[PDB]
Every structure is written in structure tokens, then in C-alpha cells.
């Protein structure tokens, strides 16, 4: 079984052509055809708005304060008895994420990979820079990748990952507990909608 | 001390973003900054004549070369007396004039090599040849570099003794300083950029 968690962490909840971004992300998930269930994971404060809108549709769980609290809590609920085989975690602001991408992630989990991110080559030269604005070096662009969501995991791994802490990107948790994570093509359409420019692009895209 | 700008473009240059080719937009942005005195556009020899018809008094045109670095030497070679040289990517047609002023300003403040740069929307990861994540260099202050990149001519010249100019300057030992870029300065490449470009240019 496959369950996606869309954590609410305002932005995810802003409007885009008659739908909040998080509604669209959730739909992009359901329509992938490979996702059985979406939990929306929201802090207490936003449980009313989350219910009116995403009213199942999806499971709602609420809520910690941090993003990681609400993912943790959601992890707690996906539980044991009805525990799914795989769990995706998807950024609500990646509202235009293509279903194929989604399926491409699930297919890799189905193929043994316990952890999987969608990834794109970098379009700009990348430099490492210090606090005083001085270039520290220019790492090789090949070798480096930009990563998107949804990120997919065997739920056992992601549970474990999260439990470790204390002591953003979910895969970096896995990476921290020494899990190995694998890569699949992303899609520019899956950009995080963060700015007016972002929005502008999102707008132009939906009504094309 | 004069400020010159080179636009190595040797088919992005001539692509017509609703009514103006990107080369003309790139050239205007450099001009509107108010601190660029000369622009040299390098294009393939086949297109040398046509690029003149487009740009007129705005840019002296020179013929290109095989790769990029190759032409830049040539473009460079032409002049043959500026103090600062900017190199700019014509694919960044919607660069704001301010960003260029910000680059020119840093040069006048002593820094011999300046580049505009931006924080990164997505998490960057290091990935090996098999698609296995090596790690997340979140602590390295990674940055997305833009153009125009600016140098003292003297420094840019020594450097020419892979499309990122500043790399050579770091390669001869020279230190490069950063200023803030601007997302408007993005590189128009993918179909999505084209759409982004349109949305903006006609907003």
C-alpha cells in the first residue's frame, strides 16, 4: 500500500485558479493512480480551514508546530495495524507536480530501493560562498543535482529516520541515520511555488 | 575608467521573445544600467551582418569562434582600453539593470572579480554516477551564479592565459566576491523558461 503525507508547512493554502496549492498537490497525488491515501498533516491552528477545504479527499491529522512534529504525528498514525508498505512525503507548494513523476518514484520503491528522490540537473553554475561574500570554490555541476518531492520511503525507514531526532528535506534525515537513497528523474513542472514569479509561472501554466 | 561588456554568443541569441531577440534585450539591459559604456556582441560570422542590423549604434559586433572561451579572447582582443570587463549571457535577456549596476559598483569598490548569485529553491544533493546520493552539502553555502560577471580587464586577461568565466579567475588564484543577483536574471533555456519569459515580458 502507498500513503502520501502532505504537510501544511500558509503558502500551501494560497489560491491558484480556484484551488489552494495544497488541494492541487493532493490531487496530483491521487491522480497519479499509484497513491492509495493522502494524509494532510496540519498544525492545530489550521484544522478548521484544512477540514473545510481538504475534507476527505484526504485524512487530516493535526498537529504539532514544526513541520517535523506534524510529519512525526502523521507517522504515528500510519501506525502498525494499517501500516502501508511505502510512504511519500510531498511539498504542498509543488502543486503542478506531474503524476508520471509520482509514479516514477513509486516504481523505484517497488524495485527494492528503500529511499528515492526526484532530481533535476542544475541550470546554473554552482559556487560555495562564505559569510563575507567570497567564493570558496566551484564544485562540479555534474555530480550535483536539484531535488524535488514527493520523496518515497519504505515506511519502516522513514519512521526510524524520524525517531532519530533530537538529535526541510526528509531524505536528509535518512541520510543522517546512514540509509542510502536513490535517484529518479524529476520534472521542472514540480518546482516549489514560492514567489510571485513562481506564482506568475504557475498561473500561466494552469490556464494555457 | 571605462566599463565594457562582452556578450559571447557563438539558437538563443536570435530567438525572438515577443518582438525582440534575446540579444537585443540582453544588450538593452546592459545599457540601461547606466554604467556600461561599451558592448561587444560576438556572434557566428554567418550571423555577423544580421546582428548589426538589429543592434545598430548599441553594440559593435564581432565574429565568434568554436566554443565560448575561444571567442571571448577574440572579443577581448578587439579594442584592443577599458578598466573593467563584464561578460554577460544573452540567454539572460530579462536581467534587471540594477543587478548590473550592483556588479559594476562592486568593481569600483576594489574587488577585482564580481559575480551575482542567488540562494537555491531546491535542496542540492551530491549524486554519484549510479544515482546514489552521496550527500546533502547543506553547510557549504551553495549559491546559484548568474551574469553579468565582472572583472578588471587586467585580471580577465591573465585568466585567458567552462561557460563560467569566474572559474578561470579562481583557477589562476584570483579571489572572487559576490553580490545579490535577481531571479529575473534567469537563463532562458527550457520551454518552461520561455513561458516564464513570456509571462513576465508581457505582464
The structural domains of chain B, ordered by start, are 1-203 (3.90.550.10)
Would you call B166 and A138 a contact, using CB atoms and an 8 Å cutoff? yes
Closest A-chain CA to B170: A137
Would you call B178 and A129 a contact, using CB atoms and an 8 Å cutoff? yes
Across the interface, of A124, A136, A189, the residue whose CB is closest to B141 is A136
Closest A-chain CA to B193: A201
Interface-testing mutation among A11, A111, A133, A179, with chain B (most B C-beta atoms within 10 A): A133
Q: Which residue has the cell 564581432?
A: B62
User: B32, B28, B36: which is closest to B4 by C-alpha?
Assistant: B36
3-state secondary structure of B177: strand
- The Cα–Cα gap between B20 and A128 comes to 35
Strand B3-8 to strand B38-43: parallel, antiparallel, or no bridges (unpaired)? parallel
Would you call A124 and B131 a contact, using CB atoms and an 8 Å cutoff? no
Instruction: Give every CB contact of residue B203 below 8 A, 6+ residues apart in sequence.
Output: A200
Across the interface, of A131, A135, A169, the residue whose CB is closest to B170 is A135
Burial class (CB within 10 angstroms; exposed 0-12, middle 13-18, buried 19+) of A65 = exposed
Residue B193 phi, psi (nearest 5): -65, -45
Q: What is the resolution of this structure in A?
A: 2.4
Distance of CA B156 to the CA centre of its chain: 14
Task: Decide: A29 and A98 in contact? Cβ < 8 Å.
Answer: no
Interface-testing mutation among B114, B116, B128, B141, with chain A (most A C-beta atoms within 10 A): B141
Joined together, the cell numbers standing for residue B8 give 559571447
> In angstroms, what separates the C-alpha of A169 from chain B's closest C-alpha?
7
Distance of CA A102 to the CA centre of its chain: 10
Would you call A126 and B141 a contact, using CB atoms and an 8 Å cutoff? no
Residue A184 phi, psi (nearest 5): -140, 155
- The Cα–Cα gap between B126 and B134 comes to 5
Burial letters A89-114, b for 16+ CB under 10 A, else e: bbbbbbbbbbbebbebbbebbeeebb
3-state secondary structure of A133: coil
- The Cα–Cα gap between B191 and A111 comes to 32
Task: Decide: B58 and B39 in contact? Cβ < 8 Å.
Answer: yes
Instruction: Give every CB contact of residue A197 below 8 A, 6+ residues apart in sequence.
Output: B183, B184, B196, B200
Q: How far is CA A151 from CA B97, B130, B148, in A?
A: 39, 18, 36
> In angstroms, what separates the C-alpha of A90 from chain B's closest C-alpha?
13
Burial letters A13-27, b for 16+ CB under 10 A, else e: beebeeebbbbbbbb
Task: Decide: B45 and B13 in contact? Cβ < 8 Å.
Answer: no
* Axis crossing angle, helix B97-108 with helix B22-32, rounded to the nearest 10: 50
Gaps in chain B (C to N distance exceeding 2.5 A) after:
10, 80, 161
| HSE (side-chain half, CA atoms, 13 Å) at A17 | 13
Residues in B closer than 8 angstroms to A201, CB to CB, are: 192, 195-196, 199
- The Cα–Cα gap between A28 and A39 comes to 14
Would you call A148 and B121 a contact, using CB atoms and an 8 Å cutoff? no
> In angstroms, what separates the C-alpha of B79 from chain A's closest C-alpha?
29
Residues in A closer than 8 angstroms to B144, CB to CB, are: 122, 124-126
Distance of CA A36 to the CA centre of its chain: 16
Dihedral over alpha carbons B88, B89, B91, B94 (to 10 degrees): -20
Identify the DSSP state of B15: -
Would you call B192 and A180 a contact, using CB atoms and an 8 Å cutoff? no
Joined together, the cell numbers standing for residue B49 give 551582418
Residue A192 phi, psi (nearest 5): -75, 120
Residues in B closer than 8 angstroms to A149, CB to CB, are: none
Identify the DSSP state of B162: -
Q: How far is CA B111 from CA A97, A168, B38, B155, in A?
A: 42, 35, 21, 11
* Axis crossing angle, helix A196-206 with helix B191-201, rounded to the nearest 10: 110
Size of interface A-B (CB pairs under 8 A): 145
**What's the full length of chain B, in residues?**
203
> In angstroms, what separates the C-alpha of B56 from chain A's closest C-alpha?
31
- The Cα–Cα gap between B152 and B83 comes to 6
For residue A45, is it left (φ>0), alpha (ψ between -120 and 50) or beta? alpha
Strand B142-145 to strand B123-127: parallel, antiparallel, or no bridges (unpaired)? unpaired
Q: Which residue has the cell 578587439?
A: B78
- The Cα–Cα gap between B141 and A129 comes to 5
Strand partners, B132: A182
Dihedral over alpha carbons A173, A179, A184, A185 (to 10 degrees): 30
Instruction: Give every CB contact of residue B47 below 8 A, 6+ residues apart in sequence.
Output: B13, B14
> In angstroms, what separates the C-alpha of B106 from chain A's closest C-alpha?
11
Task: Decide: A90 and A4 in contact? Cβ < 8 Å.
Answer: yes
> In angstroms, what separates the C-alpha of A82 from chain B's closest C-alpha?
31
Joined together, the cell numbers standing for residue B202 give 508581457
Residues in A closer than 8 angstroms to B123, CB to CB, are: 146-147, 168-169, 172
For residue A79, is it left (φ>0), alpha (ψ between -120 and 50) or beta? left
Task: Decide: B133 and A173 in contact? Cβ < 8 Å.
Answer: no
3-state secondary structure of B68: helix
- The Cα–Cα gap between B117 and B153 comes to 21
User: A71, A162, A167, A158: which is closest to A116 by C-alpha?
Assistant: A158
- The Cα–Cα gap between B72 and B171 comes to 17
* Axis crossing angle, helix B48-55 with helix B22-32, rounded to the nearest 10: 50
Interface-testing mutation among B94, B115, B121, B169, with chain A (most A C-beta atoms within 10 A): B121
| Tally: H helices and E strands in chain A | 7, 10
Rg (chain A; Cα; Å): 17
- The Cα–Cα gap between B121 and A82 comes to 35
Joined together, the cell numbers standing for residue A69 give 512534529
Joined together, the cell numbers standing for residue A153 give 520511503
Burial letters B25-48, b for 16+ CB under 10 A, else e: bbbbbbbebebbebbbbbbeeebb
Q: How many CB atoms lie within 10 A of CB A49?
A: 14
User: B63, B124, B47: which is closest to A147 by C-alpha?
Assistant: B124
Distance of CA A24 to the CA centre of its chain: 13
Containing B98, the helix (H) or strand (E) segment is helix B97-108
Would you call B183 and A169 a contact, using CB atoms and an 8 Å cutoff? no
Identify the DSSP state of A84: -
- The Cα–Cα gap between A124 and A141 comes to 8
Amino acid at each position: 500500500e502507498v500513503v502520501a503525507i502532505v504537510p501544511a508547512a500558509p503558502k500551501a493554502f494560497y489560491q491558484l485558479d480556484g484551488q489552494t496549492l495544497i488541494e492541487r498537490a493532493v490531487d496530483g497525488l491521487l491522480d497519479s493512480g499509484v497513491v492509495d491515501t493522502v494524509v494532510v498533516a496540519v498544525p492545530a491552528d489550521r484544522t478548521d480551514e484544512a477540514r473545510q477545504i481538504l475534507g476527505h479527499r484526504a485524512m487530516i491529522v493535526a498537529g504539532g508546530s514544526n513541520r517535523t512534529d506534524t510529519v512525526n504525528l502523521a507517522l504515528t498514525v500510519l501506525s502498525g495495524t494499517a501500516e502501508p508498505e511505502f510512504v511519500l512525503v510531498h511539498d504542498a507548494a509543488r502543486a503542478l507536480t506531474p503524476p508520471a513523476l509520482v509514479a516514477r518514484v513509486v516504481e523505484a520503491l517497488r524495485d527494492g530501493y528503500a529511499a528515492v528522490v526526484p532530481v533535476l540537473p542544475l541550470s546554473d553554475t554552482i559556487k560555495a560562498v562564505d559569510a563575507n561574500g567570497v567564493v570558496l570554490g566551484t564544485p562540479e555541476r555534474a555530480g550535483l543535482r536539484a531535488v524535488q518531492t514527493p520523496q518515497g520511503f519504505t515506511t519502516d525507514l522513514l519512521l526510524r529516520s524520524y525517531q532519530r531526532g533530537s538529535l526541510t528535506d526528509d531524505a536528509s534525515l535518512v541520510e543522517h541515520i546512514g540509509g542510502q537513497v536513490q535517484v529518479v528523474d524529476g520534472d521542472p513542472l514540480a518546482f516549489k511555488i514560492t514567489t510571485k514569479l513562481d506564482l506568475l509561472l504557475a498561473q500561466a501554466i494552469v490556464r494555457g
